[PDB]
């Protein structure tokens, strides 16, 4: 309290006077602990990768996906335990990172001199990690202060932490404590820099730590966001915006994106009906622009980026595959013919269960895009339906491991892009 208000921003290389700070916080923050609260951060310090990993499993399994007991309630402990440890005003926090949590493949030490960084490298990097918000999947832990040692990792993070952020002191070793912030997070680059640490230059990110609206498996706040937003939307309709809205819903989508991608007809229809429908749909997705900044999900097929079900590049089980798709596909804008059904659940849908391609879709204030579940009869669907002709900005590929019968027993890719 005392050192709380009297610490600095930035503790930058005073570490006996961030371990004194981590120190009592970290004494008082445990004597606020459950049993299950202290069991479970004591579970984090002894195994975060595996907690985070699932993290990551379960929020976007099926449904009734029941998982591992003990790592749910480790999930829920740990994230009430940083709660009781909130920041009073901001924090910078550091650690070393690698690029492909920037979705960055090219090597950043010049190849004369590994001491070095590359100058164009550096330059390509610092386009890769402009107009992009990283989503932080799991608890993240830092240190709080420069590091003083070497890293086989390309970049230092500089991350602010505002105000208000749980943020709880913790470790074994009580000189060089760490910090562990909450789920929920992203990171946005504010500054790129090279910067030399024991005779060795690193690519120094300075960043934020923001919070993105993702309701991941959040149905109440979800469905709530969606009837605030777009019940006037609903209301607005023409009959017949309505009409063919509902139409492309309940199964008139698969002749109308096939139209839209290629112009195929089916010998039952005409150009007419189908384009009367896409104008009807497209004029109403621009009648209320998305108000906020919003994560969204697609469970999306193969043939969104050139594969097939069968092609040898789609078996993620092999890391050659996942390598080969995050250098096709990293960094490149791709074109979107089609209209984009989005869920702004992380749930995995049991129509699309085996679908390996995760799209997390960052949806920018003023897309032409609905919630469109709004409408009657989507009680258990949370639909954010885009308008055609956007492009998807590739920023992240995370591959992860569905290790459910139902969700086809699989690495699958987590895509995470924003909507140009
Ligand atoms: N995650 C989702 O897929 C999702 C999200 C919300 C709602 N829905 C609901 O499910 C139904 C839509 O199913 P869907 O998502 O399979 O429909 P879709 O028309 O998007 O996809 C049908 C097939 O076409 C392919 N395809 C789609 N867009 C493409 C493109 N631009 N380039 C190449 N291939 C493309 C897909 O990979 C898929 O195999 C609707 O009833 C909708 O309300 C689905």
Same mark, same amino acid.
């Given at each position: 309290s005392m050192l709380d208000d009297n610490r600095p921003m930035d503790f930058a290389k005073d570490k006996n006077s961030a371990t004194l700070w981590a120190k009592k916080r970290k004494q008082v923050w445990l004597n606020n602990l459950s049993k299950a609260?202290?069991?479970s951060i004591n579970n984090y310090i002894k195994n975060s990768s595996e907690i985070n990993s699932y993290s990551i499993k379960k929020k976007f399994a099926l449904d009734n996906y029941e998982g591992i007991e003990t790592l749910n309630e480790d999930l829920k402990?740990?994230?009430?335990?940083?709660?009781?440890?909130?920041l009073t005003k901001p924090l910078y926090v550091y650690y070393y990172e690698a690029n492909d949590k920037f979705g960055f493949n090219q090597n950043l030490e010049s190849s004369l001199d590994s001491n070095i960084i590359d100058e164009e490298a550096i330059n390509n990097f610092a386009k890769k990690i402009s107009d992009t918000n990283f989503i932080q999947d799991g608890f993240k832990d830092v240190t709080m202060t420069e590091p003083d040692i070497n890293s086989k990792l390309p970049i230092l993070v500089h991350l602010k932490l505002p105000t208000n952020t749980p943020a709880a002191s913790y470790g074994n070793? =009580?000189?060089?404590?760490?910090?562990?912030?909450?789920?929920?997070?992203? *990171?946005?680059?504010?500054?790129?820099s090279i910067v030399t640490i024991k005779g060795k230059q690193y690519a120094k990110v300075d960043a934020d730590l923001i919070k993105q609206l993702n309701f991941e498996n959040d149905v109440?706040?979800?469905?709530?966001?969606?009837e605030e937003n777009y019940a006037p939307w609903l209301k607005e309709l023409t009959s017949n915006e309505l009409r063919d809205i509902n139409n492309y819903l309940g199964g008139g989508y698969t002749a109308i994106n096939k139209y839209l991608l290629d112009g195929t007809i089916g010998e039952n229809t005409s150009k007419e009906d *189908? =384009? =009367?429908?896409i104008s009807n749909i497209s004029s109403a997705l621009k009648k209320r622009k998305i108000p906020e900044d919003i994560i969204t999900y697609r469970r999306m097929g193969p043939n969104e980026f050139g594969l097939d079900l069968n092609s040898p590049d789609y078996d993620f089980n092999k890391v050659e595959n996942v390598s080969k798709f995050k250098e096709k596909w990293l960094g490149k804008t791709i074109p979107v013919k089609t209209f984009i059904s989005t869920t702004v659940l992380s749930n995995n849908i049991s129509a699309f269960a085996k679908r390996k391609l995760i799209?997390?879709?960052?949806?920018?204030?003023?897309?032409?895009a609905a919630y469109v579940s709004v409408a009657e009869g989507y009680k258990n669907e949370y639909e954010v339906l885009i308008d055609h002709g956007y492009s998807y900005k590739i920023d992240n590929i995370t591959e992860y491991y569905? =290790?459910?019968? *139902?969700?086809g027993k699989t690495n699958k890719l987590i895509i995470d892009a924003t909507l140009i």
């Open positions: 609260e202290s069991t402990n740990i994230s009430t335990a940083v709660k009781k440890s909130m070793d =009580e000189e060089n404590l760490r910090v562990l912030i909450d789920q929920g997070y992203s *990171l946005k680059a504010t500054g790129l109440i706040s979800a469905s709530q966001w969606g *189908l =384009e =009367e429908k799209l997390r879709l960052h949806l920018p204030n003023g897309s032409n569905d =290790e459910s019968s *139902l969700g």
